[PDB]
Write an enzyme that holds these catalytic residues in place. Structure first.
Site, PDB file in Angstrom:
ATOM      1  CG  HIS A   1      -2.086   0.951   1.161  1.00  0.00           C
ATOM      2  ND1 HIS A   1      -2.335   1.769   0.082  1.00  0.00           N
ATOM      3  CD2 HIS A   1      -3.013   1.272   2.105  1.00  0.00           C
ATOM      4  CE1 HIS A   1      -3.359   2.563   0.365  1.00  0.00           C
ATOM      5  NE2 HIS A   1      -3.792   2.274   1.581  1.00  0.00           N
TER       6      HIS A   1
ATOM      7  CG  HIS B   1      -4.388   0.434  -8.375  1.00  0.00           C
ATOM      8  ND1 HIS B   1      -5.739   0.414  -8.089  1.00  0.00           N
ATOM      9  CD2 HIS B   1      -3.844   1.395  -7.587  1.00  0.00           C
ATOM     10  CE1 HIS B   1      -6.014   1.381  -7.222  1.00  0.00           C
ATOM     11  NE2 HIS B   1      -4.882   1.996  -6.905  1.00  0.00           N
TER      12      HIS B   1
ATOM     13  CG  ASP C   1       2.308   4.728  -3.845  1.00  0.00           C
ATOM     14  OD1 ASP C   1       1.871   3.751  -3.183  1.00  0.00           O
ATOM     15  OD2 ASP C   1       1.810   5.878  -3.749  1.00  0.00           O
TER      16      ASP C   1
HETATM   17  C1  LIG Z   1      -1.017  -5.374  -4.323  1.00  0.00           C
HETATM   18  C2  LIG Z   1      -1.128  -4.745  -5.698  1.00  0.00           C
HETATM   19  C3  LIG Z   1      -1.219  -3.220  -5.546  1.00  0.00           C
HETATM   20  C4  LIG Z   1      -2.410  -5.215  -6.387  1.00  0.00           C
HETATM   21  O1  LIG Z   1      -2.372  -6.638  -6.576  1.00  0.00           O
HETATM   22  P1  LIG Z   1      -3.697  -7.481  -6.209  1.00  0.00           P
HETATM   23  O2  LIG Z   1      -3.765  -7.731  -4.704  1.00  0.00           O
HETATM   24  O3  LIG Z   1      -4.903  -6.837  -6.880  1.00  0.00           O
HETATM   25  O4  LIG Z   1      -3.350  -8.827  -6.989  1.00  0.00           O
HETATM   26  P2  LIG Z   1      -2.341  -9.968  -6.509  1.00  0.00           P
HETATM   27  O5  LIG Z   1      -1.331  -9.683  -5.417  1.00  0.00           O
HETATM   28  O6  LIG Z   1      -3.304 -11.135  -6.303  1.00  0.00           O
HETATM   29  O7  LIG Z   1      -1.510 -10.123  -7.871  1.00  0.00           O
HETATM   30  C5  LIG Z   1      -2.092 -10.638  -9.088  1.00  0.00           C
HETATM   31  C6  LIG Z   1      -0.979 -11.201  -9.976  1.00  0.00           C
HETATM   32  O8  LIG Z   1      -0.225 -10.129 -10.595  1.00  0.00           O
HETATM   33  C7  LIG Z   1       1.144 -10.175 -10.184  1.00  0.00           C
HETATM   34  N1  LIG Z   1       1.547  -8.783  -9.855  1.00  0.00           N
HETATM   35  C8  LIG Z   1       0.688  -7.816  -9.430  1.00  0.00           C
HETATM   36  N2  LIG Z   1       1.386  -6.655  -9.235  1.00  0.00           N
HETATM   37  C9  LIG Z   1       2.673  -6.880  -9.549  1.00  0.00           C
HETATM   38  C10 LIG Z   1       3.927  -6.089  -9.553  1.00  0.00           C
HETATM   39  N3  LIG Z   1       3.880  -4.768  -9.186  1.00  0.00           N
HETATM   40  N4  LIG Z   1       5.079  -6.704  -9.944  1.00  0.00           N
HETATM   41  C11 LIG Z   1       5.120  -7.997 -10.315  1.00  0.00           C
HETATM   42  N5  LIG Z   1       3.999  -8.748 -10.312  1.00  0.00           N
HETATM   43  C12 LIG Z   1       2.787  -8.280  -9.955  1.00  0.00           C
HETATM   44  C13 LIG Z   1       1.154 -11.079  -8.954  1.00  0.00           C
HETATM   45  O9  LIG Z   1       2.410 -11.752  -8.813  1.00  0.00           O
HETATM   46  C14 LIG Z   1       0.043 -12.061  -9.231  1.00  0.00           C
HETATM   47  O10 LIG Z   1       0.589 -13.011 -10.151  1.00  0.00           O
HETATM   48  P3  LIG Z   1       0.029 -14.530 -10.383  1.00  0.00           P
HETATM   49  O11 LIG Z   1       0.124 -15.180  -9.019  1.00  0.00           O
HETATM   50  O12 LIG Z   1      -1.385 -14.317 -10.929  1.00  0.00           O
HETATM   51  O13 LIG Z   1       1.000 -15.096 -11.396  1.00  0.00           O
HETATM   52  C15 LIG Z   1       0.025  -5.265  -6.588  1.00  0.00           C
HETATM   53  O14 LIG Z   1       0.006  -4.725  -7.888  1.00  0.00           O
HETATM   54  C16 LIG Z   1       1.497  -5.059  -6.201  1.00  0.00           C
HETATM   55  O15 LIG Z   1       1.826  -5.566  -4.972  1.00  0.00           O
HETATM   56  N6  LIG Z   1       2.007  -3.738  -6.462  1.00  0.00           N
HETATM   57  C17 LIG Z   1       3.359  -3.367  -6.038  1.00  0.00           C
HETATM   58  C18 LIG Z   1       3.318  -2.584  -4.717  1.00  0.00           C
HETATM   59  C19 LIG Z   1       2.697  -1.215  -5.014  1.00  0.00           C
HETATM   60  O16 LIG Z   1       3.143  -0.513  -5.909  1.00  0.00           O
HETATM   61  N7  LIG Z   1       1.647  -0.835  -4.269  1.00  0.00           N
HETATM   62  C20 LIG Z   1       1.127   0.535  -4.358  1.00  0.00           C
HETATM   63  C21 LIG Z   1      -0.335   0.570  -4.842  1.00  0.00           C
HETATM   64  C22 LIG Z   1      -0.807   2.035  -4.795  1.00  0.00           C
HETATM   65  C23 LIG Z   1      -1.355   2.404  -3.424  1.00  0.00           C
HETATM   66  O17 LIG Z   1      -1.210   1.672  -2.464  1.00  0.00           O
HETATM   67  C24 LIG Z   1      -2.179   3.670  -3.225  1.00  0.00           C
HETATM   68  C25 LIG Z   1      -3.673   3.418  -3.585  1.00  0.00           C
HETATM   69  O18 LIG Z   1      -3.795   3.678  -4.989  1.00  0.00           O
HETATM   70  C26 LIG Z   1      -4.249   2.028  -3.224  1.00  0.00           C
HETATM   71  C27 LIG Z   1      -5.690   1.687  -3.653  1.00  0.00           C
HETATM   72  O19 LIG Z   1      -6.530   2.530  -4.036  1.00  0.00           O
HETATM   73  O20 LIG Z   1      -6.029   0.489  -3.602  1.00  0.00           O
HETATM   74  C28 LIG Z   1      -4.441   4.477  -2.840  1.00  0.00           C
HETATM   75  O21 LIG Z   1      -4.615   5.560  -3.410  1.00  0.00           O
HETATM   76  O22 LIG Z   1      -4.801   4.265  -1.677  1.00  0.00           O
END
Ligand SMILES: CC(C)(COP(=O)(O)OP(=O)(O)OC[C@H]1O[C@@H](n2cnc3c(N)ncnc32)[C@H](O)[C@@H]1OP(=O)(O)O)[C@@H](O)[C@H](O)NCCC(=O)NCCCC(=O)C[C@@](O)(CC(=O)O)C(=O)O
Ligand SMILES: CC(C)(COP(=O)(O)OP(=O)(O)OC[C@H]1O[C@@H](n2cnc3c(N)ncnc32)[C@H](O)[C@@H]1OP(=O)(O)O)[C@@H](O)[C@H](O)NCCC(=O)NCCCC(=O)C[C@@](O)(CC(=O)O)C(=O)O
Lengths: 379, 381
Positions: free
Chosen positions: B220, B260, B315
């Site tokens: 997050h 996201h 971010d």
């Molecule tokens: C957690 C999430 C933000 C979203 O992922 P989900 O929980 O929807 O999905 P998931 O963890 O189940 O991932 C789905 C798949 O996508 C892959 N994946 C998803 N994001 C990735 C990434 N960034 N790098 C590599 N792989 C990524 C993940 O491995 C997985 O692969 P498979 O198991 O299907 O093979 C991820 O993209 C990931 O961790 N991002 C990197 C960390 C990051 O940048 N986080 C910042 C998000 C922005 C913020 O928190 C602010 C926010 O916008 C948040 C909001 O509104 O929600 C706000 O204004 O409050």
């Protein structure tokens, strides 16, 4: 559309705790909480069960207790995070302040299979230390730390009150600890789960859980229920108070009702038994008990048919009062938190280790349609 | 009741009037106003705060009054300042904010949810958040305590006090934009944790404490530091693809600042942050170097992850903007500046929930543990 209150939404699986809300059955890792209490299990045995998944042998228990007692020493600044606050402050908010202090200073915390259970065991120890110092500050006593003893419950009570607790007090506190250990995913555990699902640290997870526990609809009822009995003052006054406040005043009966139980809370039944036994020895407390049982009869007659029955918080305050804790500053809710910290941590570890996913729901938009940014004069 | 709603994906937890997101087309509106339209139009951050607390943009009269209420928050008690300064200087900035807000949760014994007073409480707390964050930054940097003072802008009041010098108009305008961009985002993990807390009818300050707890995590708000820390690690633009292949493509780590729960396209806030990061960093060559690593890595990331709907989020660029303004890369300070902004959205959501759709939030879990078994005394185990 809307899953109001997340009712019946499953947010995880768990091996820790099962609840049958229709039959009023509660089990910890397959053991009924009645069986655990009858057995005279020590609270540390049940903490071990939550962290490791089985009851400990005598050898494992010795090893475990040594890790917990590591937490009895806490930094001067964590104590000072409490004592630097005003004394009229809510006891749970004081615990939050102290845990936030560790969240802040534990810069090395990392989620790791190999260290999670030891961090959690030491934190159960620190929760004792923090809760002792919360109570001392509220009562304007010197700071003090729990010392290793025959039991966690005894160590806590002896440091809190600064005297030797009796066997009956220790046994009642031990049972309180076990009864509040966990309850699957209530609001407090849920708020903590949301926090750790961002991979935020264990201590922040505890801090969030405490923020939720505090409210009157959740663990704050541990003080609001007994405050009703305190208002009533005299048993003759029960029926009138009840019609004035509950039937005609639309207020909720505190200590009744539950998201899951649609029958008598099995923990409430045990707490009621202890309250009766412990209070009868203390005339001022015994009369609170008497008010509570008369009120309970009215409540059950009015609400039983709606599936709204006594919950744990209806009786737990009387148990705490009989042990020697005063009705002030939401102390009773802080005592709930002391116990519940074991279940919070066990849930966060199970979540992060085995079924990690960011918790991020949606909302239904019912606001204004797209519209052009208005300049100030034309508003 | 057998299926698990994993991460509560697509579960609706409340209705809202405040913020709408289109995840496939990449649209964010606040109270019907597009964020692109808000920034282009030159809105002050105080107008958008008002928008969130009251439901419309303020007239010139309402705005002058609103700003006065906010400024009452600039005076915070010495034990709230001390809740920060007695902590180790090495501590996480967001956890220091949490310590300071928990101190308020403890001492605000008179708080009560009330349609009459909720919005004044929330306005004053936005001023207090400015004072708390100033003091977190100061403590981290081993500077004396200071309080913001009224000035022409909330952003200027904050910067002037944080740095102890007059901020330039360029710095002020950047901070003002960062405040608007981070105001709210419907029900992210932080807002959700806070909503859970307030659903017990716990106080507003506890709701904020729970939100801070969740924002801190690297999936997050912690990404605001973790993404820029990637750029800092790479150090040489020639080295970007190598880093990306060693860390990300082999599956060792997630690309921080990408992806996201909602957006399956470029985050509209990230487009705006990117434009500012570019303009501001180009004026400081050491920071411009960071921006150039970031855009090189961004090109590789979108080519690798674009087809999965994984794109730059807010971010990815926000740390660069804060770095260009003068904030160092240490102690999760960038996440604290995220929290500074988002406190408005948090409170506006909590107020909307408690006032109009209150219900305890209390889900279930599916039990997969041991079947019923008899307790065995410890001597016989
Ligand atoms: C957690 C999430 C933000 C979203 O992922 P989900 O929980 O929807 O999905 P998931 O963890 O189940 O991932 C789905 C798949 O996508 C892959 N994946 C998803 N994001 C990735 C990434 N960034 N790098 C590599 N792989 C990524 C993940 O491995 C997985 O692969 P498979 O198991 O299907 O093979 C991820 O993209 C990931 O961790 N991002 C990197 C960390 C990051 O940048 N986080 C910042 C998000 C922005 C913020 O928190 C602010 C926010 O916008 C948040 C909001 O509104 O929600 C706000 O204004 O409050
Ligand atoms: C919040 C809840 C606990 C549960 O209610 P729900 O959210 O499931 O149901 P609701 O708020 O939608 O109420 C449904 C209806 O039932 C009524 N109702 C529910 N509880 C009532 C009550 N106690 N008195 C009067 N009416 C009550 C309520 O007004 C409403 O009536 P209408 O609007 O249809 O007219 C209520 O019963 C209620 O506020 N209880 C009083 C406060 C209280 O005692 N709280 C303590 C609960 C126990 C704990 O927090 C500990 C806990 O067991 C919690 C857990 O596991 O969840 C744990 O171990 O962690």
């Amino acid at each position: 559309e809307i899953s109001k209150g997340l009712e019946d939404v499953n947010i995880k699986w768990t091996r820790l705790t099962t609840i049958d809300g229709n039959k009023g059955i509660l089990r910890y890792g397959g053991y009924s909480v009645e069986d655990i209490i009858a057995s005279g299990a020590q609270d540390e045995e049940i903490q071990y069960l939550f962290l490791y998944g089985n009851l400990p042998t005598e050898q494992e228990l010795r090893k475990y207790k040594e890790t917990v007692q590591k937490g009895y020493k806490i930094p001067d600044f964590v104590i000072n995070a409490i004592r630097q606050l005003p004394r009229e402050s809510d006891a749970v908010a004081m615990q939050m302040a102290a845990v936030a202090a560790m969240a802040a200073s534990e810069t090395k915390f990392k989620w790791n299979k190999d260290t999670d259970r030891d961090v959690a065991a030491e934190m159960i120890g620190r929760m004792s230390a923090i809760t002792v110092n919360v109570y001392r500050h509220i009562m304007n006593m010197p700071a003090e730390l729990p010392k290793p003893s025959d039991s966690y419950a005894e160590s806590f009570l002896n440091a809190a009150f600064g005297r030797k607790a009796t066997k009956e007090e220790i046994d009642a506190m031990n049972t309180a600890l076990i009864l509040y250990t966990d309850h699957e995913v209530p609001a407090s555990t849920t708020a903590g789960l949301v926090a750790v699902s961002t991979l935020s640290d264990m201590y922040s997870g505890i801090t969030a859980a405490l923020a939720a526990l505090k409210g009157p609809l959740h663990g704050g009822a541990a003080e609001a229920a007994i405050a009703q009995f305190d208002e009533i003052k005299d048993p003759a006054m029960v029926e009138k108070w009840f019609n004035d406040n509950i039937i005609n005043g639309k207020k909720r009966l505190m200590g009744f009702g539950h998201r899951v139980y649609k029958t008598y809370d099995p923990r409430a039944k045990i707490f009621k038994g202890i309250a009766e036994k412990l209070s009868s020895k203390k005339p001022e407390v015994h009369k609170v008990y008497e008010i509570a049982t008369k009120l309970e009869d009215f409540g059950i007659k009015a609400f039983g048919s709606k599936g709204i029955y006594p919950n744990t918080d209806y009786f737990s305050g009387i148990v705490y009062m009989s042990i020697g804790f005063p009705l002030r500053n939401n102390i009773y809710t802080a005592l709930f938190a002391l116990s519940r910290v074991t279940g919070w941590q066990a849930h966060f570890i199970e979540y992060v280790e085995e079924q990690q996913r960011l918790i991020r729901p949606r909302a239904v938009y019912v606001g204004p349609a797209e519209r052009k940014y208005v300049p100030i004069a034309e508003r």
